[PDB]
Amino acid sequence: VQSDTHIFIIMGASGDLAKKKIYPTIWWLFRDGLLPENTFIVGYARSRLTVADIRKQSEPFFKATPEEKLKLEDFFARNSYVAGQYDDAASYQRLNSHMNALHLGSQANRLFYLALPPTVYEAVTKNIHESCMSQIGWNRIIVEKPFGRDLQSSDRLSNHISSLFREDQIYRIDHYLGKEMVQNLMVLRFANRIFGPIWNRDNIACVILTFKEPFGTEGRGGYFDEFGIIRDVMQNHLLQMLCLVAMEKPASTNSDDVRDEKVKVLKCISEVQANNVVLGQYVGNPDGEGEATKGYLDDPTVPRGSTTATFAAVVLYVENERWDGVPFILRCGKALNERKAEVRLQFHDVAGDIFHQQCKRNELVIRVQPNEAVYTKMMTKKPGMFFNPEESELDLTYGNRYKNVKLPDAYERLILDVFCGSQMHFVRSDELREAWRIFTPLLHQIELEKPKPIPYIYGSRGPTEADELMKRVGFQYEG
Amino acid sequence: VQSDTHIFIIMGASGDLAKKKIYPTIWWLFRDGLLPENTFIVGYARSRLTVADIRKQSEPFFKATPEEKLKLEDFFARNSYVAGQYDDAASYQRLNSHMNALHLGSQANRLFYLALPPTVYEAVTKNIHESCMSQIGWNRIIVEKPFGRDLQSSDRLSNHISSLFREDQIYRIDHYLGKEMVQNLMVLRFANRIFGPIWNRDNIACVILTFKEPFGTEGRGGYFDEFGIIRDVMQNHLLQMLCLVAMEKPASTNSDDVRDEKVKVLKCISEVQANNVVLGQYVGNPDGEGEATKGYLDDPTVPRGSTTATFAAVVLYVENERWDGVPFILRCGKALNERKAEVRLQFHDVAGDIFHQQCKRNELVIRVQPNEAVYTKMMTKKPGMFFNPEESELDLTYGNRYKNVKLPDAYERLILDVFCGSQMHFVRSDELREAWRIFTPLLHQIELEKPKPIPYIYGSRGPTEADELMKRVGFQYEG
Amino acid sequence: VQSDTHIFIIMGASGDLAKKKIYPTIWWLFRDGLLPENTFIVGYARSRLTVADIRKQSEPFFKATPEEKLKLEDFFARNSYVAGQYDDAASYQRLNSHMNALHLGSQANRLFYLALPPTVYEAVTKNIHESCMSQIGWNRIIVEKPFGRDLQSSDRLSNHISSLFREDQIYRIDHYLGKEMVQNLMVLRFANRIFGPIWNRDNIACVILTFKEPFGTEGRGGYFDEFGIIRDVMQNHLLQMLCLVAMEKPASTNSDDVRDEKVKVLKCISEVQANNVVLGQYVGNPDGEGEATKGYLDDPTVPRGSTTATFAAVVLYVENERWDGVPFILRCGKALNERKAEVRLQFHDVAGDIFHQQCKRNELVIRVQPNEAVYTKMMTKKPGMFFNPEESELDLTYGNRYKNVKLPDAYERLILDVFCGSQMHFVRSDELREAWRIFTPLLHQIELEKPKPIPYIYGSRGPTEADELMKRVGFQYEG
Amino acid sequence: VQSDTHIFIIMGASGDLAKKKIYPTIWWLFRDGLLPENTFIVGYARSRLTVADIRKQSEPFFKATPEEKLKLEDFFARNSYVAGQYDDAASYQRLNSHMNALHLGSQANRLFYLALPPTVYEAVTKNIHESCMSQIGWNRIIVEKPFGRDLQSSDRLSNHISSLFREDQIYRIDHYLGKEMVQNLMVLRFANRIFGPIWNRDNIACVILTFKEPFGTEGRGGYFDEFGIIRDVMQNHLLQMLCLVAMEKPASTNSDDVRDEKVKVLKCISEVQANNVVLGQYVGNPDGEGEATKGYLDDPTVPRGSTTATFAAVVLYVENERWDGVPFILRCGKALNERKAEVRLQFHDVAGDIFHQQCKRNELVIRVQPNEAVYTKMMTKKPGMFFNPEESELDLTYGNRYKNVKLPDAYERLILDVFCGSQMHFVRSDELREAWRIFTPLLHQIELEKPKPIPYIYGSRGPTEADELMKRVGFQYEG
Ligand SMILES: O=P(O)(O)OC[C@H]1O[C@@H](O)[C@H](O)[C@@H](O)[C@@H]1O
Ligand SMILES: O=P(O)(O)OC[C@H]1O[C@@H](O)[C@H](O)[C@@H](O)[C@@H]1O
Ligand SMILES: O=P(O)(O)OC[C@H]1O[C@@H](O)[C@H](O)[C@@H](O)[C@@H]1O
Ligand SMILES: O=P(O)(O)OC[C@H]1O[C@@H](O)[C@H](O)[C@@H](O)[C@@H]1O
Known part of the structure; x- marks a missing residue:
C-alpha cells in the first residue's frame, strides 16, 4: 500500500542470475500487482544494451501467457538500462543522473540488487554510497552469497560495507x-x-x-x-x-x-x-x-x-x-x-x-x-x-x-520484504x-x-x- | 480355546435385541470366521419355537448377501432352541440336558448372553447357577444394561450376581x-x-x-x-x-x-x-x-x-x-x-x-x-x-x-472378547x-x-x- | 480417646526383646497417658513367673524416675502373667480364660505382640486363632522379622497366617x-x-x-x-x-x-x-x-x-x-x-x-x-x-x-498405631x-x-x- | 590497574552526602586496603576550604577507632581540595593542573564522583569533558540519583551525558x-x-x-x-x-x-x-x-x-x-x-x-x-x-x-567496582x-x-x- 516512487536497480543485468531469477521474479511481482505502482526498474552492466535487448534475452524466462502481452508492455515501459563500468566513478554518476530524471527519481526509494560476483561487491558498494544514493527516500542494498569464505574474509567485507551502510540498510539473502x-x-x-x-x-x-x-x-x-x-x-x-x-x-x-x-x-x-x-x-x-x-x-x-x-x-x-x-x-x-x-x-x-x-x-x-x-x-x-x-x-x-x-518463490517474498523494510528473514x-x-x-x-x-x-x-x-x-x- | 467346544446361550432369544442385534452379530463373527470351530448357538426363551422361525425373524438383520445362502445353513445348523420359563427349574433342567446332548456339551465352555428385562436378571442368574452350569469348562455371563436405577439399586443386582458368580465370570457391557x-x-x-x-x-x-x-x-x-x-x-x-x-x-x-x-x-x-x-x-x-x-x-x-x-x-x-x-x-x-x-x-x-x-x-x-x-x-x-x-x-x-x-461392530469385537477371556472393555x-x-x-x-x-x-x-x-x-x- | 477395654498380650514375656523393648515401651505409653484407660497387659511364656518377677527383671529397663513410683504401681497393677507352652492347646485355653476374667475381658480388643522367634510364629498364630480370640472386640497380631529368608519361605508363612487372619488384622513391623x-x-x-x-x-x-x-x-x-x-x-x-x-x-x-x-x-x-x-x-x-x-x-x-x-x-x-x-x-x-x-x-x-x-x-x-x-x-x-x-x-x-x-521411639508410635487401627506404617x-x-x-x-x-x-x-x-x-x- | 595511579575526584565535597557517605566510604575502602596503592582523593567544591576542615566535618562519620589515628594521616595525606564554581572554566582549569601536579596526574585513571544537585549535573559533565579529562588513562563518571523527574526529563539528562561520555564511562547508581x-x-x-x-x-x-x-x-x-x-x-x-x-x-x-x-x-x-x-x-x-x-x-x-x-x-x-x-x-x-x-x-x-x-x-x-x-x-x-x-x-x-x-556497604562494594570496571551493578x-x-x-x-x-x-x-x-x-x- 505505497505511494512512494520506487527504483529497483539490478546491478549486473546482463548476468544470468538477473536474467533468469531477478528479472523474471520482479515481473511476477509487477504482474500480481504486488509492487508499488510507481516502481521503475533499472539494469546496470558493462554491456551496452537497450531495454529491447534485456527483454529479448529475459522473456524466454518469464513463463508468460499470451494474455499478459499488455502487462508485459507496461512492465518494460517502466524499464531502463544504463551501461557503465563497475570500478569507474563517472559511469556510476551517469547511473545517478538517470535515476534523478526518472519521474520523482530524486525522492524515490532506491533498492539496489547486487546481482554480481563477490569479487565486485566492495567496488560497487563504495561507488553506490558516494554517487548512487537518494537523500530524501531510503536506500537499501540487496546482497547475496557468498559472504566470504573465511571468518576473516567475511569480517573483511562485513566491515567495509558496515562502514558505509547501516544494518537497517543491508539486506543479505x-x-x-x-x-x-x-x-x-x-x-x-x-x-x-x-x-x-x-x-x-x-x-x-x-x-x-x-x-x-x-x-x-x-x-x-x-x-x-x-x-x-x-x-x-x-x-x-x-x-x-x-x-x-x-x-x-x-x-x-x-x-x-x-x-x-x-x-x-x-x-x-x-x-x-x-x-x-x-x-x-x-x-x-x-x-x-x-x-x-x-x-x-x-x-x-x-x-x-x-x-x-x-x-x-x-x-x-x-x-x-x-x-x-x-x-x-x-x-x-x-x-x-x-x-x-x-x-x-x-x-x-x-x-x-x-x-x-x-x-x-x-x-x-x-x-x-x-x-x-x-x-x-x-x-x-x-x-x-x-x-x-x-x-x-x-x-x-x-x-x-x-x-x-x-506458494511463492523465496525471491518474490524475499524481494517483497526488502520493499517493506522487513529484515527478519535476512541474515x-x-x-x-x-x-x-x-x-x-x-x-x-x-x-x-x-x-x-x-x-x-x-x-x-x-x-x-x-x-x-x-x-x-x-x-x-x-x- | 481355538480347538475347544463352545456353547453360546442366547437368553431371551425371541426378544428384539436378540433377533435384531445378538443373532445378527453372532452370525457375522461366524461368517467372517472369528468364532471357534466347535461353537453351538442355543436360544432360550418362552415362545415355543423352531430354529426355522428364529431364522425368519432375525434373517432380515443378517446384512447377508445371496452369495452366502449356504453359510447360513452352516450357521443355523449349529442352532438350537429351548422353550421354557425364567423361574421354573423344570424348563432349565431341559436347557441343560440339551447342551449336555450337544457334542461334548458336558465338557464345553458356556456363554450366557442375557437378552432379557432387568426384572428377570435376578431369577435367571440363580437358575443358571442352579442347573445350566458347566463343571468341565468355563462359565461366563454377559449382562447388559441397565444395571439398576440407583447406587442402592445396582448394589442389589451386583451383590446377587456376585453371590453366585465371580468377576472373571461377569461380563458387564x-x-x-x-x-x-x-x-x-x-x-x-x-x-x-x-x-x-x-x-x-x-x-x-x-x-x-x-x-x-x-x-x-x-x-x-x-x-x-x-x-x-x-x-x-x-x-x-x-x-x-x-x-x-x-x-x-x-x-x-x-x-x-x-x-x-x-x-x-x-x-x-x-x-x-x-x-x-x-x-x-x-x-x-x-x-x-x-x-x-x-x-x-x-x-x-x-x-x-x-x-x-x-x-x-x-x-x-x-x-x-x-x-x-x-x-x-x-x-x-x-x-x-x-x-x-x-x-x-x-x-x-x-x-x-x-x-x-x-x-x-x-x-x-x-x-x-x-x-x-x-x-x-x-x-x-x-x-x-x-x-x-x-x-x-x-x-x-x-x-x-x-x-x-x-472397522468392526462394538458387539462383534466385544463378544469375541468374552471368547478370549478379556474383561478390559467390560465394566x-x-x-x-x-x-x-x-x-x-x-x-x-x-x-x-x-x-x-x-x-x-x-x-x-x-x-x-x-x-x-x-x-x-x-x-x-x-x- | 477410647473407652473400649484393651488387652495387650506380650507372647514371650521372659524374652529379652519384651523385657528391654516391649515392656518398657508400653510403660512409656502408659505413663505419658497415651494408652486407653482400660488397658491390661498380659505376658505369656513357658517360665512360671509372677508380676513381681517380670517387674524385677524389667524395671532396670524402664528408665524410671523416683517420681513415677505411683504410676509404676498402677502399671503393674494392670499386669498379669500366664505361664503356658507354645505348641500346647490347653496352655492357650488357660490364657483365654484368664483374659475373659479380666474386667470385660470378653468384649475387650485383643492385641497380640509376637515377641517370639519365627521358628514359633505358626504354632502361635494357629493356636491364638482357635482359642485366644475375642468375638465382640477386634483382635490384632503384631508381627516382626524375620518374615522368612526366601520368597518361598515367606509366602509359606504369609499364606499360613493369611488363612487364619485377614490383612486388617495383621500388623507387620x-x-x-x-x-x-x-x-x-x-x-x-x-x-x-x-x-x-x-x-x-x-x-x-x-x-x-x-x-x-x-x-x-x-x-x-x-x-x-x-x-x-x-x-x-x-x-x-x-x-x-x-x-x-x-x-x-x-x-x-x-x-x-x-x-x-x-x-x-x-x-x-x-x-x-x-x-x-x-x-x-x-x-x-x-x-x-x-x-x-x-x-x-x-x-x-x-x-x-x-x-x-x-x-x-x-x-x-x-x-x-x-x-x-x-x-x-x-x-x-x-x-x-x-x-x-x-x-x-x-x-x-x-x-x-x-x-x-x-x-x-x-x-x-x-x-x-x-x-x-x-x-x-x-x-x-x-x-x-x-x-x-x-x-x-x-x-x-x-x-x-x-x-x-x-521425638518418640519407633515402637511407641508404631505400637500406638496398632491401637488406632492404622496400618499405613506396617508392611x-x-x-x-x-x-x-x-x-x-x-x-x-x-x-x-x-x-x-x-x-x-x-x-x-x-x-x-x-x-x-x-x-x-x-x-x-x-x- | 593494581599498580596504576588513580584520582578520586569528589565533586560537591562539602555537601552532606559527600561528608556523610562518600568520604567516610572512600576511607574504609582505604583502611581495609581495597583501594589501589597510588590513589589520590581530590575534593572539588565552592566553599574555599582546607583538607583540615574537610577532616573535621567528615571525621565524625569515619566509624574510626583510636587505634587508627595514623592511617587517617596516611589517608588525608592523599587528599586535596580545589575550590571553584560549577560553571566557570577558570575554576576547572585549576582542578586539572592540580591533578596534573599530582604524581603521574597526566597519566592517571580518573573517577568523578558527583555529589551535587541534579541542576548542576548538566554544567559539570560539560566542563569535565571540556577540561578535567585524562588522555592517558580512563575516565569514569559516577552519577547518582535522581536521574530526572520523568521519561522526558531523564531523556534530557541521559542524552546530554551520553553526548559527552560513553556507557563504559557512565556509572549510574x-x-x-x-x-x-x-x-x-x-x-x-x-x-x-x-x-x-x-x-x-x-x-x-x-x-x-x-x-x-x-x-x-x-x-x-x-x-x-x-x-x-x-x-x-x-x-x-x-x-x-x-x-x-x-x-x-x-x-x-x-x-x-x-x-x-x-x-x-x-x-x-x-x-x-x-x-x-x-x-x-x-x-x-x-x-x-x-x-x-x-x-x-x-x-x-x-x-x-x-x-x-x-x-x-x-x-x-x-x-x-x-x-x-x-x-x-x-x-x-x-x-x-x-x-x-x-x-x-x-x-x-x-x-x-x-x-x-x-x-x-x-x-x-x-x-x-x-x-x-x-x-x-x-x-x-x-x-x-x-x-x-x-x-x-x-x-x-x-x-x-x-x-x-x-558484609560490606553497598557503596564500599559499588565504588570498588568503578575501580575494576564492572558495570553489572550500575543502571x-x-x-x-x-x-x-x-x-x-x-x-x-x-x-x-x-x-x-x-x-x-x-x-x-x-x-x-x-x-x-x-x-x-x-x-x-x-x-
Ligand atoms: O533448495 P533449492 O532452492 O533448490 O536451492 C538449492 C541450491 O541453493 C544454493 O544456494 C546452493 O549454492 C546450491 O548448490 C543449491 O543446490
Ligand atoms: O452410538 P450408538 O452405538 O448408536 O448407541 C446409541 C444408543 O446407545 C444406547 O446405549 C442408548 O440407550 C440409546 O438411547 C442410544 O441411542
Ligand atoms: O537403626 P536402629 O534403630 O539403630 O536399628 C538398627 C538395627 O535394625 C535391626 O532391624 C537390624 O536387625 C540390626 O542389625 C540393626 O542394627
Ligand atoms: O535501605 P537503605 O540503604 O537505607 O536506603 C533507604 C533510602 O534509600 C534512598 O534511595 C531513598 O531515597 C531514601 O528515602 C531511603 O530511606
Whole structure:
C-alpha cells in the first residue's frame, strides 16, 4: 500500500542470475500487482544494451501467457538500462543522473540488487554510497552469497560495507528463509501449545536438518570445488533452519527481536569437531544413465585430484538449558537419491513400556520440500480387530488442505520484504560472524590436512559411515 | 480355546435385541470366521419355537448377501432352541440336558448372553447357577444394561450376581468400550511421547465429552421416560470415555491393571452438583421436516407433564495431581443438529503472545463417530504471501488412511472378547459402583424436586444455558 | 480417646526383646497417658513367673524416675502373667480364660505382640486363632522379622497366617517406618510444591539410601551369619525408604491407599544384577581399641570360613516415567566409620554454565539420624566482597527449631498405631512378596557360588570398589 | 590497574552526602586496603576550604577507632581540595593542573564522583569533558540519583551525558544493587537446579517485592514532597529487584550480558495502571512514642494540602512465556511497623490435596535486610506423635552460618567496582529509559488528577486497601 516512487536497480543485468531469477521474479511481482505502482526498474552492466535487448534475452524466462502481452508492455515501459563500468566513478554518476530524471527519481526509494560476483561487491558498494544514493527516500542494498569464505574474509567485507551502510540498510539473502515451511517454523513453534512442553532435551532425542539433491555438480565443478558443500549449504541454509528450531521465543515477531534470538542460539554452539564430522565425494554410477555415470572428478572443470566433499554429515551442539546435550545432525549432500529439504525431531522413547518394544520413537517432521508438509509420526492401535500398536501419522499437507493456493518463490517474498523494510528473514552481520566461528576451524583443517573424502555412488544415500555417526550420536532408524 | 467346544446361550432369544442385534452379530463373527470351530448357538426363551422361525425373524438383520445362502445353513445348523420359563427349574433342567446332548456339551465352555428385562436378571442368574452350569469348562455371563436405577439399586443386582458368580465370570457391557476410537485412547496417550507432557492440568484448559443424535425418541418415549438421558448415556458411555482420557498409565495392558486405573480415577471424582448441570427436553420444529415436527410430549407413550431430560450437560471434576481444577464437560442430547460422539481437549493459550490475539486454543480431537478420526487443531502461518497465523490441523482420518480396512461392530469385537477371556472393555463391580455414587445424589434431586427441563427445538443444539455453563467453566469457543 | 477395654498380650514375656523393648515401651505409653484407660497387659511364656518377677527383671529397663513410683504401681497393677507352652492347646485355653476374667475381658480388643522367634510364629498364630480370640472386640497380631529368608519361605508363612487372619488384622513391623524423618518423607514430598517439579529423572541424577553403624556384629555373629546384611537391613529398611521416595502420590493418606502406591513402586523394580552389587566383610583393626581390633571371622560364634557380607552396595532401578533410568543406590553396612541413616537426592548439573564449573550438584538430604534434619545443599554467592559461587545450605534441624520437643521411639508410635487401627506404617503381604522377588535371585546366587566378600578395616567407609560402582552409575563426590 | 595511579575526584565535597557517605566510604575502602596503592582523593567544591576542615566535618562519620589515628594521616595525606564554581572554566582549569601536579596526574585513571544537585549535573559533565579529562588513562563518571523527574526529563539528562561520555564511562547508581542478598539473586537462581523449574508462572502464584521503614520524613519532607515514594524507592530499588528475580539466564556473568537480560524484562512490562495502585500518606499516632505523634502534614517544610504519597503498592505484570499472568507486587512505604527489604515468591497450592486444607502455600524468601537471609517456608509433618502437617522452614541465615564474615556497604562494594570496571551493578541508559516508560503515565496522572492518598497511622502497615489489592490479584495470606 505505497505511494512512494520506487527504483529497483539490478546491478549486473546482463548476468544470468538477473536474467533468469531477478528479472523474471520482479515481473511476477509487477504482474500480481504486488509492487508499488510507481516502481521503475533499472539494469546496470558493462554491456551496452537497450531495454529491447534485456527483454529479448529475459522473456524466454518469464513463463508468460499470451494474455499478459499488455502487462508485459507496461512492465518494460517502466524499464531502463544504463551501461557503465563497475570500478569507474563517472559511469556510476551517469547511473545517478538517470535515476534523478526518472519521474520523482530524486525522492524515490532506491533498492539496489547486487546481482554480481563477490569479487565486485566492495567496488560497487563504495561507488553506490558516494554517487548512487537518494537523500530524501531510503536506500537499501540487496546482497547475496557468498559472504566470504573465511571468518576473516567475511569480517573483511562485513566491515567495509558496515562502514558505509547501516544494518537497517543491508539486506543479505539466504533464500531458504523465503521458503514457506522454513518461515512456518516460527508459528508452528510459538503459536502452539501442543509443541511447547515437548520442545526440549527432556523429550527430544535428536534433531535432523536434511539437504538432498538427486543430481550433482553439473559440468560446473570448477566453481563448486573452491567451495565444498559445508560452505555451500551447511554454514547457511542448514544452520539457519537449526536456529529457527533451537532459538528461544522472541519478545515479538519484530525484525531485530527475532534476529537477536537467532544469534543467541549460534552463540551457545561450540565448534565442529573433526570427530563428529563425515565428508564424502561422489564417484560415478557405471549402471546408470547420462550424467549419472559421471563422478565428480570426471569433470574437467574439476581439479585433478580433489579432496572436496559433496556430502557432509555433521553433529553440532547447542549448549544451553533447552538443548544441553541434544545432538543436532546436519546431513547435506549432492548426487544423493532424492530431492529433500526437511527438519526432523525424533522424540525419546516412552518411560515404562506396556507395549513390549512394539512402539517406535515419535517424530515431528517439517518437509520444506517437495510436497510441503508438517506431519507427526506416532502410534495408533492397529485398525480393525487388532489390539497392537502400529505406526501411523497425523498430517498437514499443503497439497490437499491448500490445493489451490500458490506458494511463492523465496525471491518474490524475499524481494517483497526488502520493499517493506522487513529484515527478519535476512541474515544479520553478527550472525555470519557466529556461523564462521563454528565452521572456520573445521574448514581450515580440511585444507591443511586435505583429508580423503569417502566416496559414494551417484544415486546413493551417501557414505554409510555417516549413518553410524548418527546412531552413535543417538539416532534410531527402524521405520 | 481355538480347538475347544463352545456353547453360546442366547437368553431371551425371541426378544428384539436378540433377533435384531445378538443373532445378527453372532452370525457375522461366524461368517467372517472369528468364532471357534466347535461353537453351538442355543436360544432360550418362552415362545415355543423352531430354529426355522428364529431364522425368519432375525434373517432380515443378517446384512447377508445371496452369495452366502449356504453359510447360513452352516450357521443355523449349529442352532438350537429351548422353550421354557425364567423361574421354573423344570424348563432349565431341559436347557441343560440339551447342551449336555450337544457334542461334548458336558465338557464345553458356556456363554450366557442375557437378552432379557432387568426384572428377570435376578431369577435367571440363580437358575443358571442352579442347573445350566458347566463343571468341565468355563462359565461366563454377559449382562447388559441397565444395571439398576440407583447406587442402592445396582448394589442389589451386583451383590446377587456376585453371590453366585465371580468377576472373571461377569461380563458387564458398555458397547462404547468396543468402539474403535474409544479403544484407541489407551494406545494414543500411553504409546506416545508427543501426547504425554501436554496431558495434564498445566496444559489442558478443559475436556469435552460429546454425545449427540439427530433423532429423538422414535415413537417410544415411555421406556426412556423412566430412565432419562443421564442414566441412558452419560453415567455409562460418556463416563467411560472420561475414564480412558483421565486415567493414569497402567502397570500393563492387563484387564484388572487397566480396570484398576479406571476405578482409581472415578474414586477421585466428587459427586455432581445441580449448579453445574443443565437439563433440556425437546419440542417440535413447526418449520419442520417430518418426525421433527413432534417433540417429547407430543407422544402418548410419554406420560403427561413429564419433566424427563432428553438432554444434559454436566461439569465434573477429577480431584488429583494431574487433573485438579480441569473441568470435564459431559454434553449429551437427543434430537439435535447432528449425530456425533467425540472426545476433545482444549488446551490453554500460549504464554506471552507475540501474534496479537490472532491465536486460537489448540485442540486434540478424537471423533469416535462418525468418520472415525483423531486430529489436532493448531496454528500455522497463513499459507502464501501472508505472515499472520491461521487455524489448520494435522489429521489421521481413518476413511482416507485406512480406506480398505474394516472397522468392526462394538458387539462383534466385544463378544469375541468374552471368547478370549478379556474383561478390559467390560465394566467391573467397583467401577459401576463408583459411577452411581457420582450421579445418584443428583438423579434423586431430579426425582424429588422435579425441575422443569429447558425446552429446545428439534434439530437445534440444545439449551443455550448449556453453552453458557461451558463458558463459565473455561470453555473457549470460536464463534 | 477410647473407652473400649484393651488387652495387650506380650507372647514371650521372659524374652529379652519384651523385657528391654516391649515392656518398657508400653510403660512409656502408659505413663505419658497415651494408652486407653482400660488397658491390661498380659505376658505369656513357658517360665512360671509372677508380676513381681517380670517387674524385677524389667524395671532396670524402664528408665524410671523416683517420681513415677505411683504410676509404676498402677502399671503393674494392670499386669498379669500366664505361664503356658507354645505348641500346647490347653496352655492357650488357660490364657483365654484368664483374659475373659479380666474386667470385660470378653468384649475387650485383643492385641497380640509376637515377641517370639519365627521358628514359633505358626504354632502361635494357629493356636491364638482357635482359642485366644475375642468375638465382640477386634483382635490384632503384631508381627516382626524375620518374615522368612526366601520368597518361598515367606509366602509359606504369609499364606499360613493369611488363612487364619485377614490383612486388617495383621500388623507387620519395620521399625524404620516408625522413625520421625522416615515418616516425614510423605509430607515433605506431597505437601510441598518446591519439591515437586524437581522430583524426577529430569532433575535427579541419583538417589542414595544409606545405613551405617560404627560397630559390627558384637560377639553375636552366629545369628547374623545365617542372615547377611541385605536380608538384615536392605530388603527391609533401605527398601522401605526407597518406596517412600519413589512412590507416586496416593489418593489419600489412607492406610491402604498409601500402601498400594508402595507396591506399585516395588513392581516397577527389576531384579538386582550381581554386576551392580558389591558385598564386603569386616576384618579387624590392628591399630584400634577393644572390639575394634576384632574382625568378624574373629568371632567364635562365627562359622569357620565365611563368605557372609557385613556391607552391601547395590544399584536398583525403578522402571517408570518418573524414575526411568535413575539409579537408586542402597549402601548399607556395619563396622563403618559412623552412625547414619539418610536419604539423599543428588540433582543434575545446571545446563549452560556461566560460573565455569565452579558449581557443585545440588542435593536434598533427609537425615533419619542422628541429628534429625532435612537440608538443601546448594550454591550461594561467596559472602562478603566476593562474586564467586560457594557451596552452602538451607537447613531444617530438629535440634534447633524443635529444641524442646521429644521425638518418640519407633515402637511407641508404631505400637500406638496398632491401637488406632492404622496400618499405613506396617508392611503389607504383597510388599514382602515384591521385596523377595528382587533380592531372592541375588541372595540365592551368593549361596551357590559363595563369592568372597571384599574385606574392609573396622572403622572404614567400606570397600573402595563400592564408591566406583557409584561414580560408574552416575554419582559425583567432590564436596 | 593494581599498580596504576588513580584520582578520586569528589565533586560537591562539602555537601552532606559527600561528608556523610562518600568520604567516610572512600576511607574504609582505604583502611581495609581495597583501594589501589597510588590513589589520590581530590575534593572539588565552592566553599574555599582546607583538607583540615574537610577532616573535621567528615571525621565524625569515619566509624574510626583510636587505634587508627595514623592511617587517617596516611589517608588525608592523599587528599586535596580545589575550590571553584560549577560553571566557570577558570575554576576547572585549576582542578586539572592540580591533578596534573599530582604524581603521574597526566597519566592517571580518573573517577568523578558527583555529589551535587541534579541542576548542576548538566554544567559539570560539560566542563569535565571540556577540561578535567585524562588522555592517558580512563575516565569514569559516577552519577547518582535522581536521574530526572520523568521519561522526558531523564531523556534530557541521559542524552546530554551520553553526548559527552560513553556507557563504559557512565556509572549510574542504585545502591540496592550493591546489597549482599540483592547480588546473591543471580547465583541463587542460575547456579542451582533446586530453584530452576519452580521459577515460572506454572509454579509461582505471585511475587512480592517489599520495602519498609519504621521511620518517616525526619523533619525534611519538603524535598520528598517534590518526589514521592514511587520516584523515591519503587521506580529504582524495587524495580531492580524485580529485574533480577524476573530476568532470564544471561549468556554469561558479563555486564552487558546481564544488563541485557535486565532491560529485556523491563521491555515486556506494560505501563502501570491506577486501578492497580494504592497510595497512602501517613498521619500521627496520638497514643504515640515521640516523633511518631507527627504525620506528614504536621511538618511546615511540607507544603499545605499536600497529596504526596508516603506509601505505594503497585501490581506489575511481565508479559512473557515465563511470567505471563504472575503478579509482581511492589509494596513500599515509610512510617510503618518495621524496617524490611525483601523478595518473596508465593507458590501455588499443590494439586490434589491429601492433607485436608491444612496446607499452606510454600514460599521462597530472600530478606535483603535486616538479618540477611534466604529461606523457604514449607510444610513438614508436625514433629512428635503427630501426623498432621505443620509449617516450618529451611533457612540460610547469614548471622549464624557466617557469624565471622563481614558484609560490606553497598557503596564500599559499588565504588570498588568503578575501580575494576564492572558495570553489572550500575543502571544502563535503556534500563533507566524502560523504568520511566513504565511509571511515567501514572506519575503524570497523580500530578494531574491529584488524588488524595489514603491516610494510615504512623507505625501501622499502611492502608488496608493495599492488603485488599494484594488479595484480589492472588496473594494468599495466613492470618
Ligand atoms: O533448495 P533449492 O532452492 O533448490 O536451492 C538449492 C541450491 O541453493 C544454493 O544456494 C546452493 O549454492 C546450491 O548448490 C543449491 O543446490
Ligand atoms: O452410538 P450408538 O452405538 O448408536 O448407541 C446409541 C444408543 O446407545 C444406547 O446405549 C442408548 O440407550 C440409546 O438411547 C442410544 O441411542
Ligand atoms: O537403626 P536402629 O534403630 O539403630 O536399628 C538398627 C538395627 O535394625 C535391626 O532391624 C537390624 O536387625 C540390626 O542389625 C540393626 O542394627
Ligand atoms: O535501605 P537503605 O540503604 O537505607 O536506603 C533507604 C533510602 O534509600 C534512598 O534511595 C531513598 O531515597 C531514601 O528515602 C531511603 O530511606
